[PDB]
């Protein structure tokens, strides 16, 4: 016989035939999957009285456990079973309700914001419902669904109930973001955006996808705060960190201006004791809302290579020092310019100064290299100024050895961030980055949390899925959609700090990047490591920047340039194609295919809605949803593994079946050169920066030890090709 | 270890066919001349062609001047120094003959219990447990090498939290008894507390009149007394969360592989014994023997009962069809029954148990191979019906053989204490949930047999028990007991080089085998064990297996450890033996 506990409490006989039909349904269209295999694995686990939801988890996991490179369609079998389950969990049936009935219920329960019902009529929801294709749920992979279920879909944390499905998520994000559009265009934009996201052409960050449509207005996922050399700014900085990490934002802290250990008694304000005690304070601030005091809350802190304390700073996350010599749960960005590198090559010295003893040196470091050189050499003379000398080879080695040993000491080329930038370095210098080293935006110190004259940069992110687009001209519509969706959100969201609101309203800065690059290269038969992708990458990223700029341009015509457009190099008719690192000419000869001069005039005349548009970020979650390779990164392998409380989640790289040979796995790359050239070619067009990785497999090197010679040569190759930043250093375990 | 030889000089004095013919010759030596040499021939044939396997003590000893062949004994300790001493003495005597020991020590009153006058039970169980351990190791060179015991106690014993961690690595030395295994005794109510997320109340057996007896014999009565005593605040007690208690047990089971489980209700609701006269209240070293015991008050106490078991196995790979089991059952049952009279008893209580109940434990080897050649597997339920068919035939024919023998020579003295005497059969008392996982019909005339048993009795109170085999099955080149092979080739170290053995008919069956670690989980196996337990008189050395690399972050979830435990119980599994965790 075998009985089954129903949804209520009622019990009825098992329907093995029903189970078979769901499985047959789920397996439709798929290849190399065995329904009967799934049955064998799951049925043996059934017991008299088993509840109905547990029969469901059982078949899902059974199908999931057969995901492999040889049978990758088990990703989709499991996915569909999981979807079906989630329909039942949310609606009591497979068919979703009508959009209007769903939104009304959710507003009742307080799970959707009621402005959706204010801003749209029943007629309009009826119409939106005709845009919706709930069958698009059938296109998720299993790992994708686990992410939807884990962090996207509106649900109860406590009770475990799921209240929506993916197409309502998608339609309602569109609905919310475009809700102030004139009725003439509104539902057009809603439809087009819903299409773009539901078919995976555009990806959005987790805070947006989980939050937009709910009663919250907190969606800011990364902030950039600059600390001034005063207790007031130190306090303000700290306070702003606390406020933001409580909303689970990642933090980039510029702390390079804090004067060094042993600097004169400023009267009261005690800067004698130096940087580290303050660095520890930012770290507790960053961890102020984390359960362990480690788990959650993340920050990257920035300082210049020539800071008097640099030797002490470089080793802040090294394993064994005294406890007061370490600040281990924050990452660092070491800031470097051309002169520093020149000292290395010439085998000369680097002179270390406290920023407080060298008038104008700090400002020049970012804004004006000739001026930096003048002041630097001037101050190396002057023996009245407190200074210290280190061998450049010694200093760089210390940095590179800490970078390698932790993977988490990062690099920012501050000249590149300002010579090749949408900002006039004399008005709005880029003097730091964010958590992940792809955001490059102006900041100003605060003298108090609510100081109206400070500037905090936030960034507003999205990505094009280069695998989901048949040709580059699709980027025009997608750029219109992405730029407009993000621009609306800037007005839509709230700002916990006046300085953050200033930055956003003033410059309206966007950071749109890409996912699925590796797959895209593979299907064009290119690779990372051999230069075979150089021209395609030029072609690809020209199209991205062109169309992004075009979209933001049209939007400026329609709605006005951003308040501080006059502080951009774009305002002076300067384009990314004018200011890039020239050495790039030697490694690609792709012509520009778009009318950049037409655009140049149109930008000078009408301005840009957004001061920046593009930034190449990492993606973990965004790209699992699309079954896409992460950002611009080569896959570590063909199948990725995640632990979860529900079993091992496997995801096979897209079209493994036809592309296994076309892929170039991370560790197949003979070295970093090809990749870094691709990053450089990308950086030609990108407004901000790129989360560029460096990788080393010890087993490719004599005695399994990575030579410093090579660590430094890749560093210099980065610089030569105008790479703004370097993020993680991956060293292979094995 | 089989052939008669000189330990000192290294000379071998016989060959395998003399071993075999002479074991037959000895065991059947009192048969009437009319039948004698027939039985000898048939048995010699059965063993020499590997259809029947016998334990090492028998195969090495029967024909030699010795009369010591007892390989595992079951001793119950009472709550008194006299019984503690007797128990210890009986252990010493038996381990000196290299027997494995099952010790029931669950009745020893807990630490802090009233001064009984003189007899000092204030200090509790552990100091006595250590004493049984030195007893068990009293004849072992290192003090570790040789001599093996499993000790039993109830889950609700006041000291249980201390007992569960007796083989844990680092405690104080006086908190550990590491070179003995344990069986934790559980019934339905204990499990119910777990599921309902309730408490388990811990009692010293000395403070709860009738609770101990009821635990094994009568569940309704157990529940009554248990809930009654949870009320009464005059009685010393202690409360633990069932989830906490079970987890402690399951985590110790997993970490050592050697904390075992006995479902004491199943051992008595589905049993050849009337639980009101002869309850099964313990098991043996390897958790397949389920037989009545009585405490001794002195080594030579005529009123004690020690269970021994007398073992053999059918080689399911050596038989072309199940009807061969009729002759083989006749042969096996008669050979073992003769040995009971043939062998000696170092302790009066052991002789009582054997002469009284004449209990046999005949099992199987080569199950995996048998499944493979029938194209079945362990893990998917594909073997359920074949297993039902197979084990029905085994129990039927065993019962039939023992029946004929009772006609010829008389039922065993204490047959009246069996459920068989009251016309109750294993097919009457099994766990009903088994109906949901197999629909094989009975193929034999169980009602014909029922009457014949009521009329004539059984020579033997038990017949069947599924034991592990290491040595018996290597001789036959057979897969061990009911176990799936860890791999296709096994390796042993020896002073003569690496011994390799390839699984039988690897050539034609490599794909048909399902290796231990190929099983997605334990469910299919446990259902097979349950189907087996329907017919088997005693218990089964059932294993549970876990490959960490099948679980997120390589860690086995307690959720799953507990679900397999409950699956065992649901399908009426009497005991669980080793927990194997894959190294790698």
């Amino acid at each position: 016989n075998l009985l089954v506990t129903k949804r209520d409490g009622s019990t009825e006989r098992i329907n093995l035939d029903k189970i078979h039909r769901v499985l047959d349904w789920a397996a439709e269209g798929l290849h190399n999957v065995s329904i009967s295999q799934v049955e064998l694995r799951s049925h043996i686990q059934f017991y008299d009285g088993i509840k109905t939801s547990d029969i469901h988890e059982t078949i899902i996991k059974a199908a999931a456990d057969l995901i492999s490179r040889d049978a990758p369609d088990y990703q989709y079998l499991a996915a569909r079973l999981a979807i079906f389950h989630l329909r039942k969990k949310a609606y009591g049936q497979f068919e979703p309700p009508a959009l209007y009935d769903h939104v009304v219920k959710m507003v009742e329960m307080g799970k959707y914001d009621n402005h959706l019902l204010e801003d749209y009529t029943e007629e309009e929801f009826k119409q939106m419902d005709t845009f919706i294709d709930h069958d698009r749920d059938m296109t998720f992979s299993y790992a994708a669904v686990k992410q939807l279920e884990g962090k996207y879909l509106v649900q109860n944390r406590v009770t475990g109930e799921i209240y929506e499905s993916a197409q309502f998520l998608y339609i309602l994000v569109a609905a919310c973001l475009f809700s102030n559009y004139p009725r003439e265009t509104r539902l057009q934009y809603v439809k087009r955006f819903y299409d773009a996201v539901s078919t995976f052409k555009i990806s959005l960050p987790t805070p947006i996808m989980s939050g937009v449509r709910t009663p919250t207005r907190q969606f800011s996922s990364c902030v950039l705060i600059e600390c001034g050399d005063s207790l007031d700014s130190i306090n303000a900085t700290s306070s702003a960190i606390v406020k933001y990490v409580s909303q689970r934002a990642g933090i980039g802290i510029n702390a390079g201006r804090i004067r060094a250990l042993g600097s004169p008694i400023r009267g009261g304000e005690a800067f004698h004791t130096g940087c580290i005690p303050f660095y520890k304070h930012f770290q507790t601030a960053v961890k102020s809302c984390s359960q362990g005091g480690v788990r959650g809350g993340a920050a990257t802190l920035f300082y210049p290579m020539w800071h008097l304390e640099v030797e002490s700073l470089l080793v802040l996350k090294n394993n064994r020092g005294v406890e007061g010599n370490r600040v281990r749960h924050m990452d660092y960005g070491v800031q470097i310019n051309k002169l520093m590198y020149t000292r290395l090559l010439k085998g000369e010295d680097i002179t270390l100064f406290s920023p407080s003893d060298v008038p104008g040196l700090y400002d020049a470091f970012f804004a004006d290299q000739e001026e930096f050189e003048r002041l630097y050499t001037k101050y190396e003379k002057d023996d009245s100024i407190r200074k210290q000398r280190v061998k450049a080879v010694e200093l760089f080695s210390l940095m590179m050895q800490e970078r390698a040993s932790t993977g988490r000491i990062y690099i920012q080329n501050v000249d590149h961030c300002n010579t090749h930038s949408p900002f006039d370095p004399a008005i709005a210098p880029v003097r730091q980055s964010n958590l992940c080293l792809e955001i490059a935006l102006p900041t100003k110190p605060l003298n108090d949390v609510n100081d109206e004259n400070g500037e905090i940069a936030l960034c507003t992110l999205s990505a094009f899925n280069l695998g989901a687009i048949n040709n580059l001209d699709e980027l025009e519509e997608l750029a219109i959609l992405a730029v407009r969706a993000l621009d609306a959100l800037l007005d839509y969201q709230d700002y916990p700090i006046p300085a953050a609101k200033r930055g956003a309203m003033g410059r309206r800065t966007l950071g749109i990047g890409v996912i699925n690059f590796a797959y895209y290269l593979a299907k064009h038969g290119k690779r990372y490591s051999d230069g075979s992708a150089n021209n395609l990458t030029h072609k690809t990223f020209e199209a991205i920047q062109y169309y992004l700029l075009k979209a933001s341009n049209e939007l400026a015509k329609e709605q006005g340039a951003c308040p501080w457009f006059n502080e951009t190099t774009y305002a002076k008719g300067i384009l990314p194609i004018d200011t890039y690192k020239k050495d790039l000419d030697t490694i690609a000869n792709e012509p520009l295919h778009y009318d950049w001069e037409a655009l140049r005039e149109s930008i000078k005349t009408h301005g840009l809605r957004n001061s920046t548009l593009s930034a190449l970020m990492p993606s973990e979650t965004s790209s699992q949803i699309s079954n896409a390779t992460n950002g611009i990164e080569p896959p570590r392998g063909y199948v990725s593994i995640k632990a979860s409380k529900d079993g091992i989640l496997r995801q096979v790289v897209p079209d493994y079946e036809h592309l296994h040979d076309a892929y170039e796995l991370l560790w197949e790359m003979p070295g970093n050169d090809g990749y870094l050239q691709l990053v450089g070619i990308m950086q030609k067009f990108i407004d901000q920066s790129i989360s560029a990785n460096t990788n080393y497999d010890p087993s490719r090197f004599p005695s399994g030890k990575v030579p410093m010679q090579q660590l430094l040569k890749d560093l210099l190759t980065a610089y030569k090709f105008g790479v703004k930043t370097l993020y993680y250093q991956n060293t292979r375990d094995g | 270890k089989y052939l008669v030889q000189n330990r000192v000089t290294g000379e071998i004095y016989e060959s395998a066919q003399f071993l075999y013919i002479l074991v037959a010759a000895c065991l059947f030596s009192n048969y009437p001349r009319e039948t004698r040499l027939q039985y000898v021939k048939r048995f010699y044939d059965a063993v020499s062609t590997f259809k029947i396997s016998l334990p090492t003590p028998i195969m090495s000893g029967v024909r030699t001047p010795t009369r010591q062949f007892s390989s595992c004994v079951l001793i119950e300790c009472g709550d008194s120094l006299d019984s503690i001493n007797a128990t210890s003495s009986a252990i010493v005597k038996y381990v000196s003959q290299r027997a494995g020991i099952g010790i029931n020590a669950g009745r020893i009153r807990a630490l802090g219990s009233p001064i009984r006058g003189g007899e000092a039970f204030h200090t509790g169980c552990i100091p006595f447990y250590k004493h049984f351990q030195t007893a068990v190791k009293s004849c072992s060179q290192g003090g570790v090498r040789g001599g093996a015991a499993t000790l039993f106690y109830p889950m609700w014993h006041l000291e249980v939290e201390s007992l569960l961690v007796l083989k844990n690595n680092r405690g104080v030395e006086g908190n550990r008894v590491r070179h003995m295994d344990y069986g934790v005794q559980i019934n339905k109510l204990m499990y119910t507390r777990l599921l309902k997320g309730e408490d388990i109340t811990l009692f010293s057996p000395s403070d709860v009149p009738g609770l101990y007896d009821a635990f094994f014999a009568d569940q309704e009565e157990f529940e009554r007394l248990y809930t009654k005593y949870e009320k009464d605040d005059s009685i010393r007690k202690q409360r633990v969360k069932a989830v906490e208690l079970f987890s402690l047990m399951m985590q110790e089971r997993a970490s050592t592989g050697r904390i075992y489980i006995q479902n004491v209700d199943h051992c008595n609701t589905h049993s050849p014994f009337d639980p009101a006269i002869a309850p099964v209240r313990q098991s043996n070293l390897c958790l397949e023997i389920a037989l009545p015991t009585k405490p001794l008050n002195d080594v030579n106490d005529e009123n004690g009962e020690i269970a021994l078991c007398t073992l053999s196995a059918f080689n399911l790979g050596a038989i072309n069809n199940l009807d061969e089991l009729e002759e083989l059952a006749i042969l096996a049952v008669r050979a073992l029954d003769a040995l009971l009279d043939y062998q000696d008893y170092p302790i009066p209580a052991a002789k009582r148990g054997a002469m009284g109940r004449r209990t046999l434990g005949i099992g199987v080897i080569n199950f995996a191979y048998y499944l493979a050649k029938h194209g079945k597997r362990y893990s998917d339920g594909s073997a359920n019906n074949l297993t039902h068919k197979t084990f029905e035939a085994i129990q039927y024919y065993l019962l039939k053989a023992s029946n004929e023998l009772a006609k010829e020579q008389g039922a065993c003295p204490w047959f009246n204490e069996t459920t068989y005497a009251k016309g109750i059969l294993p097919i009457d008392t099994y766990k009903k949930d088994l109906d949901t996982i197999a629909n094989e019909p009975l193929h034999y005339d169980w009602e014909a047999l029922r009457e014949s048993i009521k009329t004539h009795g059984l020579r033997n109170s038990t017949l069947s028990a599924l034991m592990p085999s290491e040595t018996s099955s290597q001789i036959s080149n057979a897969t061990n007991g009911i176990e799936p092979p860890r791999g296709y080739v096994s390796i042993k170290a020896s002073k003569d080089g690496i011994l390799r053995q390839v699984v039988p008919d690897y050539e034609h069956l490599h794909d048909a085998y399902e290796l231990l670690w190929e099983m997605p989980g334990n469910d299919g196996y446990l259902q097979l064990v349950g189907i087996m337990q329907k017919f088997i008189d005693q218990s089964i050395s059932a294993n549970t297996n876990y490959d960490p690399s099948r679980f997120p972050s390589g860690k086995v979830p307690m959720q799953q450890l507990l679900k397999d435990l409950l699956t065992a119980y649901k399908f009426g599994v009497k005991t669980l033996y080793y927990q194997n965790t894959r190294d790698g």
Partner: peptide, 16 residues
């Protein structure tokens, strides 16, 4: 070895 995470909700359904 072990992950000591246990949910009662899941267990409570089981029929002994």
């Amino acid at each position: 070895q072990i992950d000591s995470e246990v949910d009662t909700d899941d267990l409570s359904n089981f029929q002994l």
